[PDB]
């Protein structure tokens, strides 16, 4: 296995919504958070 990415509150980069559903495929290097 498991990994965790942690972001600060000040950080305005936001987790991509589709990853809030468990079981969604995470392709290594794809975007999991972005600044608006």
């Amino acid at each position: 296995x498991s990994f965790a990415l942690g972001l600060r509150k000040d950080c305005r980069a936001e987790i991509v919504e589709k990853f809030t559903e468990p079981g969604t495929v995470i392709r290594i290097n794809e975007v999991v958070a972005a600044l608006k």
Binding site: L5, T20, T24, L35
Partner: protein, 350 residues
Amino acid sequence: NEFGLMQPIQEFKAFIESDPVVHQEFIDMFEGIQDSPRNYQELCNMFNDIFRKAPVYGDLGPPVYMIMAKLMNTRAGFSAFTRQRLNLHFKKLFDTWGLFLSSKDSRNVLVADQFDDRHCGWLNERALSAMVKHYNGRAFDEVFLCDKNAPYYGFNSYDDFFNRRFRNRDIDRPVVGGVNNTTLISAACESLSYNVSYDVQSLDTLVFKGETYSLKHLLNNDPFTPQFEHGSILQGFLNVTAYHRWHAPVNGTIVKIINVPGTYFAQAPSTIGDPIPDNDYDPPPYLKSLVYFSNIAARQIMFIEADNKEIGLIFLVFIGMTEISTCEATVSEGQHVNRGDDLGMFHFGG
């Protein structure tokens, strides 16, 4: 060694017997009518065979998890598995096991042979097809660096195969947006999403309360911890079928790497006694505990400073599970990484 238990297991056994409380915990966890292992002596004997062999394809989890799952699912098991003295011994067992897994004799599972009706080697089409399921119709030898015309696909060991590299990441796993876009944070691992938590916090104790993240625990009371209060965490799970290397989530500088001794076999207390599925779909108790044991498991914490000051300081936590708990960084503090660069990898080991 040829005759008797490997000395590390023998010391493991003697430690169990040297503490009345630990010894009784290793009796109580086996309670009820059992199959093998029926007691802690059978468990040790069974470790003695597993640690001389490489894993095969076919079970839901790696070989030690398979035989520990029923013990984990007890109050007495969870109690023994959350003593640091016992977990030091597990580290040594799995570290010793990793030695064999890095030797050339671990390649005997890098074959197409079907060992029985439930198991086969990693070069059998059934295994090959499982490992490329998220690669858009491309084959294992196209996605991964290997020699499909060489014995063992050219791999030197089970660990060499477990940590295979992408042959052309820019084809199969692009750094979406390009390394030069500093507004995007890449996934550090090939995985399935497991959880996302917003407005994360710290807990005084890790019981009830939702079995959630506790920042002060997960980050081992790091001084940076307060900066991450009220933040967010995304957690993923890496299957048997998954690439096991780490990639850099941002362009940035490695600030701090911390390796934390932890547990190997601890599941969430609210799961103890839940049925362990015999199908391949429904999650077993330990696999419902990833958020819980992220606080206490053998892990590596990596703080990175993103070149983009609007992203800034982030943390990665690489979390072990049972015998796959070695977290190897291949980057150094003060090193600058570009998003997508090798950051490290998981190994079988402690």
